[PDB]
Structure 1
């Protein structure tokens, strides 16, 4: 029929050697060796093109067929070379990149090409089911080649059927891949759409002679049949006669580093922080400089200096656990788990999106409601207990050796560990200086340090997951914090006794009893919806509400505490690690006046507090106390305190919140759609439409809280206990990981023990965790001491970190100290303790009944004896496996 069709049939008639001769003949290419080495190495700061695509778009823009700007959207990014080139162009502002990825060779790559700070990529996106969005520039490289023109047509048509929905929303420019433009159905539709929306079709010489792929672009106006049949003609004429020589061109150099952006941050009160700033400058005045290409939007850029790189991403294996769990080598849910990327890159590529936000300033009515509820809560909390200053001796009483130092200034760089510094009165002399300055109204040293947290998390793109930001101040400042507001934690102000809704310090054993007590309480359903990135969502007004406690202190206590709040919380100065161009790395200093840090002493206290305030507010809105106008301004504010004193405790005891996480039990289902105040404050719901009603639950056993759902188990003798559970795969993955670089096998086995006894203590009800844990404790010498860190939760006291035997500890925590258990009868043997229900065990991630688990379980003894051999013989093992 058409020129393209006959050319295609002829191409398929060919054999392998003619295929070879033709496919490359006389096209243009780029020297890809320079890049393809850096890809194998992973040299991010090389600034090379991750795919060929970058050269394609480059040729498209240099000739002038595409004029991109503003909000750019890449469809089918793949590695992402399109997006990465997009970043470079003068007029672009935001680059989002979407592709399918996953199984098969089809994933993305993360590098440090110029302007990477505006490149937000994502995987696992069937864009056909994705609703469109209003771009300024639309890009699409989608279209799988094939032999059958039926396919090329079918697909390319489907692609267009998708992209139409987007294009109708008016992009300033566009480029779309068209695999088959040479068929009659194709030619017709392409002419119709060229008329209806514009642009024109251009064939690129970079593309190989083995496909008819053409690109539909904004800046052109050529007729379909013209360029299409010109391309077909050139392809045919290239087929016959001479194999013409490939032409070599230089691949584009993207550069490296960050790009400048619109600084929308509030101006800092230089009187407060200027001392710290100019002190830091005066200390690092040798290499101090100001980069114009700061990547910060919502923080005040205060400067940078040259520094060395900290942390890494590499993830090591605990061969103990892995060799004791070969059947789990298949599950992605465990293998994909790895370390967090704590490099400056891995930090900043989370910072720029999660942390670089400025919360919507809530309205004056919501402000008034917040301050009222916060005042009432400070009243009802400080009734029984009163504030007090904490003493040095309490600080050194609580302190341990492992705590973080925080080397900032030259005067602070003497000591090595905490236990050393605390015993040197020079330390306390500097503390007395910063205290005298604080009382005088100046701050010289309370500066925040920040880096990426060493966590065990699900890997993304088959690669290291990014590290969330953690920031804390140096020891002395933490002491000032402790003596000022140290007590709220110490006296257990958030304890269920005093608070009612809080659960400060209570372990994972108990919390399910709180959920049972809450379920016996009548009403509607249970709602536990996670608040997205709580730390960033804390606003000025919330901090001013939390500072209201100062009215219950005394003159000195109020002076020190309020001073610390003002010069520490309400104005924050941070030191952060950023990777610079050409491989070097630098330290930036920034500031802001909002949100909260993970390393603030009263993190849990303030978080739990303001979270309770939020839940109270939403309970008022749900029960028709707050009308829709009262966001703008409050009507008849007294009917707030009328409700608070009528049912406050009555509703507060219907709460179980812990820092960021929350559990609520309201009177009726209106709580599911009382989102207006919640949203106005800026406390959005994670992974849910902002305006869609919340998911509730009937059966309390299924409630997720602090990552765990709590199940009730009856003992074989008759008594009932409440146990925490979650998905097996996450725990097995966590055990697999080894945190340190270059650790001797001893300490890794120590970690394996720690995890084993953790599972025995808590997740005994899980057949695979009990089995595997007994296998670890068996294969590990019972001599050795458990070391390391297993979970970062505060509700794990660390009861498994001892040489004791776990039956006795189990009896202590689950029977002897169990407040909700009346009969104190200890249990004699392991097999009296029941497992979880077989169906529920299967659901929570168990592999019982499958043949790899049966094989591994029946040959457990051979493998464990192999572990004993590998460690080393003539060491004392105990054979825990009796059954």
Structure 2
């Protein structure tokens, strides 16, 4: 009936060659070949448009049909060229992009375009079901072209019926894709919506002649019938007559590097750290400069200089495990797992969103409750035990050669390994120099080195996930730390003996008995919620409450300890890698005064201590001790210790805290909603509504702690044992990954057998895990030594790292030293040990009963012998499970 319905009717009536003639007829395109080579390789620093949209926004803004500023929201970001051209715009200060991705559709692409430090993209977002947020610049490139206009209209109508909820929160500028602007109902809806919110409709000539797509933009204004008739008229005319020529233009060059950002960081205490700062400038004043494009909000930018890049994102496959696990070639949770990006880029694109935050300063009443509980806990812990200066002897006793250098200055660049340095008196001479400087109150060398951690983690966007940062000091600074405070890890201040709540050292075997004994305790439900990024939530108040143990020290120990505390913990200086613009990489040096590193000696101890303080505070709030105004200021300060010395240990042995993670069994169910002191301290719950009640649990077998839930199993004879478990796909993926680049197959099979014996030792109750471990240990030479690390948990001591038989190892760890199993009778055979329940094994990620696992299990000897043949025959193998 209309100029558009008739044009679309003609466009459908054509054939494939008339289609090809008309599609590109008379528009402008972009010289996209440069950008598409940089994308073929993945060259982020090239600074090219990831899409053709970058030019559509370039045109819509540069012609002046858009007035972009402030906080931007890209709806349907797809790759993200719109978001990436937004990051370049001067008045923009944060760009949020949302997309769906997944199967078939476009996952977000990560580049180094100018301003990449303000770009947060997510996938798996059906935006119709996303709530509204008040953005300053609204972007919607969400359209879905088709042959029949009946679905074009409905899809644009659903698109608008969604974006209106967003637009009624008044953004300053907008650009929304309009796929069908040419039908009766669409003309009606466009007129009514232009009246109710403003704006104007523009057709872009870069856009193909094959869709009626127009854009609803802010800085422009025009009538709907007029612009639509303009577009349909011109489209109808370009069909007949001359096939008119294409106009070439060049793609917008986005640039590269970070962007100048809000710097609301606290001023530095210059005289604590100035020695180290000016030492670094005196050492690297050659290329010393200040980059204005620091993407640091909560860190004090102190400068940068050129440096070499470290790490990679490449992930190699362990073919032993993979070829033996051919049926897991399908599960996404297994094959999508890979390595973590430890490059400067991969470290910073996690840094700018996980570390560049500033904690709310808890109120003084919560501050006083924190200090009260911390002092009471220092008293109750330092009751039996008392501090002591750790010795250089114990330091070299615990040390081994696989530690990290921390090579910062020229005086520390001699050695290559740890054991090489520990027996050289020049080392202890510089240590004594820094110790006497610490006693005088000046820090020269205690500087933090930082980079991303190499982890075996789930892949995101079908790519390598960004690496969480780890930052450690110089071994001499770690020695000063140890002589001051390492007594907390040495003397087991956190062991369940002295504390009651902690479990410092206890392996994953006994912890299930701790859970059973805690479940036998009556009360409410069991509440175990992980804390979001523990190290980043630590405040100065938490640190100053931790510095209280010094009350029980002597004068020299307290001098060294408080010197290191104040010059190291309460004042931190860091050296990090950052990808500079156009290839080059730089090292920046920054500073702050709160949070804590995972590279500290007493990381586990400090995490467990402040976590227990918080749990005590939450049990006080749950059991109504702390009133609602007491966040502001403390009323009746006595009744805090009145409850501490009446129920402190009583509620304390109902706790299991291990650094980051925690488990509590309170008195009643109110613990689920005692969240106000918890939120005020800066210790929020990870990815759950900040005020929603906590999810409790009843059956202790289904409680997670340190990535494991435990199960009780009766033996085939009668004894009762408690075993750890997690999802099978995670362990299979971790084993499938090879951490190292360039390792010989001998050592890769060493890792294969390491994982194999780890499974035989821990996850034997999983049918596939024991089966595959027997198969790996079979096809792998029992000669070679297991090397490498499996799971980074400190509760994994490393018991499967020997060619000794796992049956004997099993008897020793589960019966002879089993403190919670009295019967010392060692069972003699493998198949006497029971599996997990059929249903519970299937639930924890097992593939039993399915035809691929059946097929692979019947050809197991074929495949294992294939493995032996590939390694190299006439090596000493062993045919482990036969039944």
Shift of 1:229: 1.1
Shift of 1:288: 0.5
Shift of 1:221: 1.4
Q: Could you report, residue by residue, the CA deviation over 1:419-474 in whole angstroms, capped at 9, with x for unpaired residues?
A: 00001010000000000100000000000000000000001110010000000001
1:161 aligns with 2:158: no
Q: What SS does the corresponding residue of 1:604 show, helix, strand or coil?
A: helix
Shift of 1:784: 0.4
Shift of 1:59: 0.2
Which residue pairs with 2:10 in the alignment? 10
Shift of 1:148: 1.4
In the alignment, the residues of structure 1 paired with residue 852 and residue 352 of structure 2 have an alpha-carbon distance, to the nearest angstrom, of 44
Q: Could you report, residue by residue, the CA deviation over 1:779-807 in whole angstroms, capped at 9, with x for unpaired residues?
A: 00000000001000000010000111000
Q: What SS does the corresponding residue of 1:371 show, helix, strand or coil?
A: helix
Q: Could you report, residue by residue, the CA deviation over 1:285-318 in whole angstroms, capped at 9, with x for unpaired residues?
A: 1010000111100001111000111000000010
Which residue pairs with 1:819 in the alignment? 819
- Gap regions ≥5 residues in structure 2: none
Mean CA deviation greater in 215-224 or 347-356 = 215-224
Which residue pairs with 2:700 in the alignment? 700
In the alignment, the residues of structure 1 paired with residue 742 and residue 635 of structure 2 have an alpha-carbon distance, to the nearest angstrom, of 64
In the alignment, the residues of structure 2 paired with residue 192 and residue 684 of structure 1 have an alpha-carbon distance, to the nearest angstrom, of 45
Shift of 1:881: 1.8
Q: Could you report, residue by residue, the CA deviation over 1:302-344 in whole angstroms, capped at 9, with x for unpaired residues?
A: 1100011100000001000000000000011111100000000
Q: What SS does the corresponding residue of 2:662 show, helix, strand or coil?
A: coil
Q: What SS does the corresponding residue of 2:29 show, helix, strand or coil?
A: strand
In the alignment, the residues of structure 1 paired with residue 831 and residue 739 of structure 2 have an alpha-carbon distance, to the nearest angstrom, of 34
In the alignment, the residues of structure 1 paired with residue 178 and residue 335 of structure 2 have an alpha-carbon distance, to the nearest angstrom, of 38
In the alignment, the residues of structure 2 paired with residue 683 and residue 464 of structure 1 have an alpha-carbon distance, to the nearest angstrom, of 29
Which residue pairs with 2:416 in the alignment? 416
TM-score by length of 2: 1.00
- Taking the TM superposition and a 5 Å limit, the aligned residue runs for 1:55-66 are 55-66=55-66
In the alignment, the residues of structure 2 paired with residue 161 and residue 812 of structure 1 have an alpha-carbon distance, to the nearest angstrom, of 67
In the alignment, the residues of structure 2 paired with residue 460 and residue 823 of structure 1 have an alpha-carbon distance, to the nearest angstrom, of 48
Q: Could you report, residue by residue, the CA deviation over 1:234-281 in whole angstroms, capped at 9, with x for unpaired residues?
A: 000011111100000010000000000111000000000000000000
Number of positions where the alignment pairs a residue of Structure 1 with one of Structure 2: 883
In the alignment, the residues of structure 2 paired with residue 360 and residue 148 of structure 1 have an alpha-carbon distance, to the nearest angstrom, of 55
In the alignment, the residues of structure 2 paired with residue 18 and residue 680 of structure 1 have an alpha-carbon distance, to the nearest angstrom, of 67
In the alignment, the residues of structure 2 paired with residue 613 and residue 128 of structure 1 have an alpha-carbon distance, to the nearest angstrom, of 43
Q: What SS does the corresponding residue of 2:282 show, helix, strand or coil?
A: helix
Shift of 1:151: 1.1
In the alignment, the residues of structure 2 paired with residue 740 and residue 796 of structure 1 have an alpha-carbon distance, to the nearest angstrom, of 21
In the alignment, the residues of structure 2 paired with residue 148 and residue 323 of structure 1 have an alpha-carbon distance, to the nearest angstrom, of 48
Shift of 1:845: 0.2
Q: Could you report, residue by residue, the CA deviation over 1:814-833 in whole angstroms, capped at 9, with x for unpaired residues?
A: 00000000100001111100
Q: Could you report, residue by residue, the CA deviation over 1:400-430 in whole angstroms, capped at 9, with x for unpaired residues?
A: 0101111000000000000000010100000
Q: Could you report, residue by residue, the CA deviation over 1:673-720 in whole angstroms, capped at 9, with x for unpaired residues?
A: 111000000101001000111101111100011000000011000001
In the alignment, the residues of structure 2 paired with residue 745 and residue 105 of structure 1 have an alpha-carbon distance, to the nearest angstrom, of 38
Q: Could you report, residue by residue, the CA deviation over 1:364-419 in whole angstroms, capped at 9, with x for unpaired residues?
A: 00000000000000000011111000000100000001011110000000000000
Which residue pairs with 1:94 in the alignment? 94
In the alignment, the residues of structure 1 paired with residue 661 and residue 379 of structure 2 have an alpha-carbon distance, to the nearest angstrom, of 23
Which stretches of structure 1, 4 residues or more, deviate above 3 A after TM superposition?
none
Q: What SS does the corresponding residue of 1:656 show, helix, strand or coil?
A: strand
Q: Could you report, residue by residue, the CA deviation over 1:531-567 in whole angstroms, capped at 9, with x for unpaired residues?
A: 0010100000000000000111100000000000000
Mean CA deviation greater in 432-441 or 126-135 = 126-135
Shift of 1:759: 0.3
Q: What SS does the corresponding residue of 2:784 show, helix, strand or coil?
A: coil
Shift of 1:108: 1.3
In the alignment, the residues of structure 2 paired with residue 53 and residue 854 of structure 1 have an alpha-carbon distance, to the nearest angstrom, of 49
Shift of 1:486: 0.8
Shift of 1:360: 0.3
In the alignment, the residues of structure 1 paired with residue 819 and residue 881 of structure 2 have an alpha-carbon distance, to the nearest angstrom, of 32
TM-score by length of 1: 1.00
Which residue pairs with 2:327 in the alignment? 327
Q: What SS does the corresponding residue of 2:608 show, helix, strand or coil?
A: helix
Shift of 1:488: 0.3
In the alignment, the residues of structure 1 paired with residue 665 and residue 2 of structure 2 have an alpha-carbon distance, to the nearest angstrom, of 69
- Taking the TM superposition and a 5 Å limit, the aligned residue runs for 1:425-824 are 425-824=425-824
In the alignment, the residues of structure 1 paired with residue 748 and residue 144 of structure 2 have an alpha-carbon distance, to the nearest angstrom, of 47
In the alignment, the residues of structure 2 paired with residue 765 and residue 246 of structure 1 have an alpha-carbon distance, to the nearest angstrom, of 67
Q: Could you report, residue by residue, the CA deviation over 1:153-186 in whole angstroms, capped at 9, with x for unpaired residues?
A: 1111111111111000110111101100111111
In the alignment, the residues of structure 2 paired with residue 638 and residue 193 of structure 1 have an alpha-carbon distance, to the nearest angstrom, of 63
In the alignment, the residues of structure 1 paired with residue 68 and residue 843 of structure 2 have an alpha-carbon distance, to the nearest angstrom, of 49
In the alignment, the residues of structure 2 paired with residue 307 and residue 376 of structure 1 have an alpha-carbon distance, to the nearest angstrom, of 47
In the alignment, the residues of structure 1 paired with residue 816 and residue 107 of structure 2 have an alpha-carbon distance, to the nearest angstrom, of 54
In the alignment, the residues of structure 1 paired with residue 243 and residue 664 of structure 2 have an alpha-carbon distance, to the nearest angstrom, of 74
Q: What SS does the corresponding residue of 2:787 show, helix, strand or coil?
A: coil
Q: What SS does the corresponding residue of 2:73 show, helix, strand or coil?
A: strand
Q: What SS does the corresponding residue of 2:658 show, helix, strand or coil?
A: coil
Q: What SS does the corresponding residue of 1:705 show, helix, strand or coil?
A: coil
Q: What SS does the corresponding residue of 1:662 show, helix, strand or coil?
A: strand
Q: Could you report, residue by residue, the CA deviation over 1:477-519 in whole angstroms, capped at 9, with x for unpaired residues?
A: 0000001001100000000001110000100001111111111
Please provide the CA RMSD for this pair. 0.5
In the alignment, the residues of structure 2 paired with residue 701 and residue 190 of structure 1 have an alpha-carbon distance, to the nearest angstrom, of 58
Q: What SS does the corresponding residue of 1:704 show, helix, strand or coil?
A: coil
Which residue pairs with 2:69 in the alignment? 69
Q: What SS does the corresponding residue of 1:94 show, helix, strand or coil?
A: strand
In the alignment, the residues of structure 1 paired with residue 426 and residue 680 of structure 2 have an alpha-carbon distance, to the nearest angstrom, of 48
In the alignment, the residues of structure 2 paired with residue 16 and residue 440 of structure 1 have an alpha-carbon distance, to the nearest angstrom, of 85
In the alignment, the residues of structure 2 paired with residue 218 and residue 105 of structure 1 have an alpha-carbon distance, to the nearest angstrom, of 29
Q: What SS does the corresponding residue of 1:360 show, helix, strand or coil?
A: coil
In the alignment, the residues of structure 2 paired with residue 509 and residue 492 of structure 1 have an alpha-carbon distance, to the nearest angstrom, of 19
Q: Could you report, residue by residue, the CA deviation over 1:212-245 in whole angstroms, capped at 9, with x for unpaired residues?
A: 0111111111011110111000000011111100
Q: Could you report, residue by residue, the CA deviation over 1:60-108 in whole angstroms, capped at 9, with x for unpaired residues?
A: 0110000111100001110000000000111000001100001114111
In the alignment, the residues of structure 1 paired with residue 244 and residue 625 of structure 2 have an alpha-carbon distance, to the nearest angstrom, of 81
1:348 aligns with 2:348: yes
Shift of 1:618: 0.5
Q: What SS does the corresponding residue of 1:120 show, helix, strand or coil?
A: strand
Q: What SS does the corresponding residue of 2:253 show, helix, strand or coil?
A: coil
In the alignment, the residues of structure 2 paired with residue 236 and residue 344 of structure 1 have an alpha-carbon distance, to the nearest angstrom, of 53
Q: What SS does the corresponding residue of 1:216 show, helix, strand or coil?
A: strand
In the alignment, the residues of structure 2 paired with residue 334 and residue 242 of structure 1 have an alpha-carbon distance, to the nearest angstrom, of 56
Shift of 1:635: 0.3
Q: Could you report, residue by residue, the CA deviation over 1:595-652 in whole angstroms, capped at 9, with x for unpaired residues?
A: 0001010000000000000000000001110111001100001000000000000000
Q: What SS does the corresponding residue of 2:494 show, helix, strand or coil?
A: coil
In the alignment, the residues of structure 1 paired with residue 107 and residue 543 of structure 2 have an alpha-carbon distance, to the nearest angstrom, of 43
Shift of 1:132: 1.0
Shift of 1:129: 1.0
In the alignment, the residues of structure 2 paired with residue 605 and residue 172 of structure 1 have an alpha-carbon distance, to the nearest angstrom, of 50
In the alignment, the residues of structure 2 paired with residue 131 and residue 702 of structure 1 have an alpha-carbon distance, to the nearest angstrom, of 33
Q: What SS does the corresponding residue of 1:489 show, helix, strand or coil?
A: helix
Q: What SS does the corresponding residue of 2:121 show, helix, strand or coil?
A: strand
In the alignment, the residues of structure 2 paired with residue 652 and residue 14 of structure 1 have an alpha-carbon distance, to the nearest angstrom, of 78
